[PDB]
Structures are given as structure tokens and as C-alpha cells.
Amino acid sequence: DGTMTQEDISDYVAANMKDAISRTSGVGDVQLFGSQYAMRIWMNPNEL
Amino acid sequence: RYNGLPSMEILGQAAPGKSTGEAMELMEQLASKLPTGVGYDWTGMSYQ
């Protein structure tokens, strides 16, 4: 429905799916094809 | 927390005469009519 971006889908999987899948029966390592959201502080050197 | 998610453990039992299966089936029915984003699961003796 084009309400969630690539970065938004990656967060939801990382935050609400990955942990449970990684603890699932017979599952070894789990690799996220993306990244979980973090609080990004994009600094401006001119304003600093 | 249960399986890495916020939870609240609820104890209980079947009334005189009725079995554990019937009591659990009703809890599953009552749990389905709860607000959006509220799930459930069985643990300990109920898991077995």
C-alpha cells in the first residue's frame, strides 16, 4: 500500500520479528538484509 | 516480559466438574475480543 519505505520495513522486521525468529526451534544465525532504526544526529560543521 | 515482549502472567483454573481444555478454550475466545496489538500465549504446566 506504499505507506512504509525500505528503511521503515527494515526497522519493523529488526524490532518486532528478528528476535523471535532467532529464538525459534532449529534456527542458528539470522542475518537482517537492512538495519534497525537508531536516533540519528546528523551534525552540521558550519552551525557547530 | 515473555519471549522478549512486555507481558502480564495470569493464573486460573477450571470450575468444579469442567476440564482444563474447556477453561483454556474460553480464555482463547476472551483473548481474541481484546484491543488491537494485544496477543497471548500458554507457559509452564499449560505449555505441557
Is the separation of the CB atoms in B19 and B25 below 8 Å?
no
**d(C-alpha A8, C-alpha B28), whole Å:** 32
Say how many residues make up chain A.
48
Give the technique used to solve this structure. X-ray
Resolution in A: 2.6
**d(C-alpha A20, C-alpha A32), whole Å:** 13
The radius of gyration computed from the CA coordinates of chain A, to the nearest angstrom, equals 16
Which 3-state string (H, E, C) describes A1-48?
CCCCCHHHHHHHHHHHCHHHHHCCCCCCCCCCCCCCCCCCCCCCCCCC
Q: Which residues of B touch A19 (CB under 8 A)?
A: 4
Q: Which residue of B has its CA nearest to A21?
A: B3
Q: Which residues of A touch B (CB under 8 A)?
A: 19-20, 23
A27: cell is: 534456527
